[PDB]
Design a binder for this molecule. Structure first.
Ligand SMILES: O=P(O)(O)C(O)(CCc1cccnc1)P(=O)(O)O
Ligand SMILES: O=P(O)(O)C(O)(CCc1cccnc1)P(=O)(O)O
Ligand SMILES: O=P(O)(O)C(O)(CCc1cccnc1)P(=O)(O)O
Ligand SMILES: O=P(O)(O)C(O)(CCc1cccnc1)P(=O)(O)O
Ligand SMILES: [Mg+2]
Ligand SMILES: [Mg+2]
Ligand SMILES: [Mg+2]
Ligand SMILES: [Mg+2]
Ligand SMILES: [Mg+2]
Ligand SMILES: [Mg+2]
Ligand SMILES: [Mg+2]
Ligand SMILES: [Mg+2]
Lengths: 351, 352
């Protein structure tokens, strides 16, 4: 029903955007059609959790008129985030030379899509966030504040990606003017935490919450400090759980996990590295980041014998407690908002 | 002196940005330093025509020292928004086009310790930096919302221009993500004009003018209809002149060997030739165009000469110069300060 509403507004938004292209940018049916397929292919087929969160925050925080328009704004804000994610995933898939996403071939991997056009298709997607904001929210008092907060989270995510991409070798050797080396010097907990904070947490957890508040005109009503705290905790927990399941959950996972072969700066890797003996570490460095089936099994063994599963269980329990405390802090002043934070936490916790 | 001020403000801006990353984004000296070098390599070395126009519009419209000092400083910040936006697109474009050099130097993604993976995202940083610097320096300004919206529109527009450029290559009827890709079928004047309008004209000619008006708080003062008209005229003319010079002006006095024919460009020459040429000429052209072979290039140069495209240019130039003068005058009546800065911008274009 939320989904029904959300998908109906997508059509509304897609229609505006394509008509603007034709009426105001002189575009022709052929190219309009290319971009429609790009939109659809790129923006649809996920679970729209981030969009649907905005809707939920707003409905939680709620005369028919104010309702109808608050919920419509929520939907439009929802699609701003989905479009922004789509922007980053398109460029990421090019960056990472990946092959599929969501079952389907990556955008740039499609037969009549070039890398040349794909990169710029990506840019179009982010621009579309602005265009749909500026149109649907032209009259809203909150437009300026929405734009600025959105800009900040957009910036933040790109900074996340910088941290991800430079997680591979000693940052002391970072130098555009000097050829580049696969070492483990950046594989610390603090560096891991920082990638996940900025790459993921802000736009995945914070931004949906904040946008719910803005279109509800409720933003002053909540303690932002703890709201951010919540968002960072939940965001970090998402990726840690994923990292641990990639290793230790049988393909009931829905795929074969490849984090070890792909030489990932995962929670397992950095947590292992910090606690492991010199002998164990050396075995690790010798067997990590390779397709070879035995080398992989060696790393799984090392993880098992350092009881990283035990470490996760303790970590999860600690996170769950901090989260509940903060939610309660929230609920005291902001019961509607707190409730929806609870709901978001539930689609994450122990999946 | 404008340039002196402009460069001073760059340092101010660079310093804010780098310190924000450190204080609010937890970033370490090592990675700060990488980004400083990216900013520098990437945003510096051009002639800063776009930035400097904003300053000039603003000075020209000045007509206590406090208002002066802050209006000019706002102009500088708007200047750098545009330079940074350009740098954003040029970084991504160089990757898109697998180019080798820009501005004498290696393309950013071409540097030894820059990967394509990192470089694409470096580019995104550049554009986010435009937002961050506006939101900081203009936090208190009444015109912040309107600046951001107008800026966003021209950002959008440029990317749409790139789409037109990139799909200039084969029948747009064959345009289909789900179907592998192969023409000259898109080489029409209309399509040429539309590439240049959206890729180039808005952010190169319109946006600088518009930003000068906003920080001058003078935007309502001017006929935007004709201002827009002029900006399109001047933008198109820029590329046409360049296109004709690529062919016909000697390496000595041009500063390079021009390669538009080898690179199979949708140039003004090519579309104008295609439109007027005889069936036989057209076949010769189609048989020789877009190849490094030195004979085939010379055949095209010959076809161009024999269709007197130089005469066609000379007439086009004259027609543009005149429309532009008419429109400036229209401007000058109500908005003499503005019109004069438009005249100055037009003079940095109208030869060399
Ligand atoms: O590229 P990775 O970090 O693996 C990924 O998580 C995307 C990285 C990313 C970048 C920007 C925003 N969200 C995710 P993927 O598994 O490829 O989706
Ligand atoms: O599993 P991957 O694509 O790597 C990932 O993108 C998983 C992200 C994800 C999203 C939703 C549900 N499970 C995992 P990661 O980059 O590992 O976090
Ligand atoms: O590559 P082209 O499109 O010719 C170029 O003109 C790109 C120009 C451009 C593209 C996108 C945004 N601004 C300028 P270049 O000569 O490469 O700089
Ligand atoms: O000369 P190119 O790099 O191709 C170009 O970028 C011209 C750029 C330019 C700018 C200023 C003066 N001359 C040429 P074009 O792509 O032709 O527009
Ligand atoms: Mg990826
Ligand atoms: Mg990646
Ligand atoms: Mg994973
Ligand atoms: Mg991944
Ligand atoms: Mg190009
Ligand atoms: Mg290029
Ligand atoms: Mg040229
Ligand atoms: Mg060029």
């Amino acid at each position: 029903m939320p989904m029904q509403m959300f998908m109906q507004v997508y059509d509304e938004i897609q229609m505006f955007l394509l008509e603007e292209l034709e009426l105001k940018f002189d575009m022709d049916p052929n190219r309009v059609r290319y971009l429609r397929k790009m939109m659809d292919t790129t923006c649809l087929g996920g679970k729209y959790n981030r969009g649907l969160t905005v809707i939920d925050v707003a409905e939680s925080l709620l005369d028919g008129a104010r309702r109808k328009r608050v919920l419509h704004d929520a939907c439009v804000c929802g699609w701003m985030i989905e479009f922004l994610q789509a922007h980053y995933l398109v460029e990421d898939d090019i960056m990472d030379n990946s092959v599929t996403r969501r079952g389907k071939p990556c955008w740039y991997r499609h037969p009549d899509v070039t890398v040349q056009c794909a990169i710029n298709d990506g840019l179009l997607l982010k621009s579309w966030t602005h265009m749909m904001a500026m149109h649907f929210f032209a009259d809203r008092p909150f437009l300026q504040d929405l734009l600025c907060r959105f800009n900040r989270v957009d910036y933040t995510t790109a900074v996340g990606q910088l941290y991800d991409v430079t997680s591979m070798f000693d940052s002391n050797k970072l130098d555009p003017d000097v050829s580049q080396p696969t070492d483990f010097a950046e594989f610390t907990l603090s560096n891991y935490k920082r990638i996940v904070k900025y790459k993921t947490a802000y736009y995945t957890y914070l931004l949906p919450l904040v946008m719910g508040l803005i279109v509800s005109e409720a933003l002053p009503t909540v303690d932002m400090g703890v709201t951010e705290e919540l968002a960072m905790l939940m965001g970090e927990y998402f990726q840690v759980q994923d990292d641990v399941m990639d290793c230790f959950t049988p393909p009931r996972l829905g795929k074969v996990g490849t984090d070890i072969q792909d030489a990932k700066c995962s929670w397992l890797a950095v947590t292992f590295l910090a606690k492991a003996s010199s002998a164990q570490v050396a075995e690790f460095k010798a067997n990590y980041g390779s397709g070879d089936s035995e080398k992989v099994a060696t790393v799984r063994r090392l993880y098992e014998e350092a009881d990283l599963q035990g470490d996760y269980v303790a970590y999860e329990a600690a996170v769950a407690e901090q989260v509940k405390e903060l939610i309660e802090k929230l609920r005291l002043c902001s019961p509607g908002f707190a409730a929806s934070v609870e709901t978001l936490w539930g689609k994450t916790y122990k999946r």
